[PDB]
């Protein structure tokens, strides 16, 4: 690896120098993923279509901004394709370790709620909201672009994505689900971000097959994923040949779900 | 045959050196090779002493204090890798200084705004009502340092009565800085200050009156150069150094490693 990847008047940067510079900082993290990818692809099938179906989901939402968001996260489409594939493999290994018995699903059903869609207005302090609180004296969407410091939603009347329980900020959501009918509005909520006002747009047999999807969703925790990978790692009988990389799997060799 | 050696063996097959190289390069190759390349070009032209790097290392280490190690790990750094980045950053600083106008007219003009370092204490709180409460306790005879330990959400300084390190102009939030230098005498306390972080009260500990330019010029020069080490100027300097280096990229995977500088 004495070959030059870059030449300068001051000398060359070689393959060797680039390899070792990268390895020192990123070697453990990358070799871990390469290792898991191999052992998992051996046991679990991911089809090119499965990767495509996942890919398109993301591709639709972002529209014009798709390619732009990849670059901002240091991704190409193909490198993104690879990451979706890796995530699916881990997802499969985690699901293989899930107990999806009727009793668990029936038990999960009582706590579960469907997704909720709202608008909101974000401001720095309660008095400004109080100005907004009295502001009706008129349209919620109009005052959102007028006052909301949430640049992601301000232009769009403060419209939020659909979201479920546990999945968004606790205080915000309590207030959201308390909403009753189309377009009626909350009191002032104080979150980590600031003070909010929230407006409802959409709320909704067991209708359970959705819950099955939701339960599996909720079980894709970092703990369960780590637990699943520990089992796979153990069954693979790995031997680390490069002693620089001996600590590459530290996050998977403790009684906890992480290193330190 | 090159890099065919296994770095890891598994029942499912081996991952080789080459595969690790190529995988790292895809994600981290551009950023790492950019730094290696600039370091080599800059090392050739500009002198950095170990004395400088150590002084910089100590600066940051004390500055972050207890939270030092935690912030390194969060940025995927060791002490060793961090020290290397400081050396690299200093090289970039040298190239930027070489691009600076440090003429007497610039310095004398900078002198007008410049001040010697100032030492203050402060109390940081979430809202104005809390600050007003503290202002009333101060009037009623409670101690500023006591109220810092009781109220201040600035964990870095709250235990020590809210004492901050000495700082000059430009180094802090502008609003904070104006309010601090506006204080006249030792133990004077500010009105409510509103920064990006929250609401402050500030107490003066030490202030020094600016001397003549002749007496202060070496201080003024150091501060001026420092104020010119902006992200804009450093970027400009690296563009200029890169163009002058006439580099030749051999690995087409890395063709865009310097996109921000061409």
Instruction: Provide CB contacts within 8 A for A118, sequence distance 6+.
Output: A160, A176, A179, A198, A199, A200, A201
In this complex, do B9 and A239 lie within 8 Å of one another by their Cβ atoms?
A: yes
| CA dist list (Å): A15 to A40, A200, B34, B38 | 30, 58, 13, 16
Q: Which of B13, B33, B40 sits opposite A11 (nearest CB)?
A: B40
Residues of B in contact with A71 (CB under 8 A): none
CA dihedral defined by A114, A119, A122, A127, rounded to 10 degrees?
A: -110
Most A CBs within 10 Å, among B5, B10, B29, to test the A interface: B10
Distance CA B127, CA B19 (A): 54
B33 interfaces chain A, CB cutoff of 8 Å: yes
Report DSSP state, residue B171.
S
Pairs across A and B, CB distance < 8 A:
129
For residue B250, give every residue at least 6 positions away whose Cβ sits within 8 Å of its Cβ, in sequence order, or none.
Answer: A3, A4, A5, A6, A7
Distance CA B62, CA B55 (A): 11
10 Å Cβ neighbour count for A62? 12
Within B152-241, strands assigned E span 193-194, 199-206
Round to whole Å and give the CA distance between A103 and A224.
Answer: 19
Residue B222's nearest CA partner among B157, B180, B163, B169 is B169
Cα distance from A5 to chain B (closest Cα, Å)? 5
Residues of B in contact with A18 (CB under 8 A): 25, 29, 32-33, 36
Distance of alpha carbon A85 from alpha carbon A41, whole angstroms: 10
Q: Which of A78, A124, A227 is nearest to B197 (CA)?
A: A124
> For residue B143, how many other CB atoms are within 10 A of its CB?
12
Q: Say how far residue A125 (Cα) sits from the centre of its chain.
A: 29
The SS3 call for residue B80 is helix
B36 vs A18, A35, A39: nearest CB: A18
| Mode of pairing for the β-strands spanning A189-190 and B248-249 | unpaired
Please give the C-alpha separations between residue A206 and each of A105, A112, B222, in angstroms, as whole numbers.
Answer: 11, 11, 72
Q: What are phi and psi of A122, to 5 degrees?
A: -110, 130
B165 neighbors B186 (Cβ within 8 angstroms): no
A201 near A183, Cβ under 8 Å? yes
* Cα A149-A60-A145 angle, rounded to 5 deg: 20
DSSP type of residue A172: H
Would the CB atoms of B248 and A7 count as touching at under 8 Å?
Answer: yes
Q: How far apart are CA A227 and CA A220, in angstroms?
A: 11
Closest CA–CA distance from residue A24 to any residue of chain B (Å): 9
Q: What angle do CA B150, B153, B154 make, to 5 degrees?
A: 110
Yes or no, beta carbons of A23 and B26 under 8 Å apart: no
Compute the nearest-CA separation of B182 from chain A (Å).
27
* Shortest CA distance from B196: residue in chain A: A124
Backbone angle region of A233, left / alpha / beta, with phi > 0 → left and psi within -120 to 50 → alpha = alpha
The alpha carbon of residue B142 is apart from the nearest alpha carbon of chain A, in Å, by 28
- Residue B202 and residue B122: Cα distance in Å, rounded? 4
* Distance between first and last Cα of chain A: 35
* Closest chain A residue to B36, measured at CA: A13
For residue A185, give every residue at least 6 positions away whose Cβ sits within 8 Å of its Cβ, in sequence order, or none: A140, A179, A197, A198, A199, A200
Q: For residue A48, what are the contacts with CB-CB under 8 A and spacing of at least 6?
A: none
3-state secondary structure of A202: strand
The CA-CA-CA angle for residues A76, A81, A84, to 5°, reads 125
Q: Within 10 Å of residue B231's Cβ, how many Cβ atoms? A: 7
Beta carbons within 10 angstroms of residue A92's beta carbon: 17
Residues of B within 8 A of A242 (CB-CB) are: 7-8, 17
Rounded CA Rg of chain A: 24
Mark yes or no for CB contact B20/A30 under 8 Å: yes
Which residues in chain A are immediately followed by a break of C to N over 2.5 Å? 137, 204
Beta bridge partners of A8: A11
When scoring A241, A247, A250 by the number of chain B Cβ atoms within 10 A, the one with the most, hence best to mutate, is: A241
Measured between beta carbons, the chain B residues lying within 8 angstroms of A80 are none
Structural contact between residues B5 and A19, judged by C-beta atoms closer than 8 angstroms: no
Determination approach: X-ray
Output the six-digit token pair for A89.
Answer: 């493999």
The region, left, alpha or beta by phi > 0 then psi within -120 to 50, assigned to residue B187 is left
Q: In A117-201, which residue ranges form alpha helices assigned H by DSSP?
A: 126-134, 140-147, 170-177
| 8 Å CB contact between B157 and B148 | yes
Helices (H), A114-258: 126-134, 140-147, 170-177, 209-218, 222-235
CA–CA gap between residue B205 and residue B120 (Å, rounded): 5
Q: Output the six-digit token pair for A184.
A: 């009626």
Residue of chain A whose alpha carbon sits nearest to that of B9: A239
**Cross-strand pairs, A185:** A199
Closest CA to B98 of B216, B232, B234: B234
Considering only CA atoms, which of B229, B207, B211 is closest in space to residue B219? B211
Q: Is A16 in the B-facing interface, judged by CB distances under 8 Å?
A: no
Cβ pair A9:B44 closer than 8 A = yes
Q: What's the rounded Cα separation, in Å, for the pair B33 and B247?
A: 12
Query: Angle CA(A200)–CA(A201)–CA(A206) in degrees, nearest 5?
Result: 95
């Amino acid at each position: 690896g004495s070959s030059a990847v870059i030449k300068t008047d001051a000398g060359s940067v070689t393959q060797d120098e680039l390899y070792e510079a990268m390895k020192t900082t990123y070697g453990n993290e990358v070799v871990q993923q390469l290792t898991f990818k191999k052992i998992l692809e051996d046991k679990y099938t991911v089809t090119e279509k499965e990767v495509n179906a996942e890919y398109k989901k993301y591709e639709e939402q972002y529209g014009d901004s798709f390619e732009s968001t990849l670059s901002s996260n240091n991704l190409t489409k193909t490198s993104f394709k690879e990451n979706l594939e890796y995530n699916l493999l881990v997802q499969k290994a985690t699901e293989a370790n899930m107990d999806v018995s009727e009793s668990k699903l029936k038990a999960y059903y009582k706590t579960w709620e469907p997704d909720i869609t709202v608008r909101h207005i974000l401001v720095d302090d309660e008095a400004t909201a109080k100005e907004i609180q009295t502001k009706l004296k008129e349209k919620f969407t109009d005052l959102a672009k007028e006052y909301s410091t949430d640049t992601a939603t301000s232009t769009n009347g403060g419209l939020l994505d659909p979201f479920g329980p546990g999945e968004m900020d606790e205080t915000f959501e309590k207030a959201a689900y308390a909403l009753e009918n189309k377009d009626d509005v909350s009191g002032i909520v104080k979150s980590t971000y600031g003070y909010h006002l929230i407006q409802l747009v959409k709320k909704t047999a067991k209708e359970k097959a959705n819950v099955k999807a939701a339960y599996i969703k909720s079980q894709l925790t970092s703990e369960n994923m780590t637990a699943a990978l520990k089992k796979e790692l153990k069954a693979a009988n790995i031997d680390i040949k490069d002693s620089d990389l001996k600590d590459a799997f530290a996050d998977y060799t403790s009684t906890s779900s992480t290193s330190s």
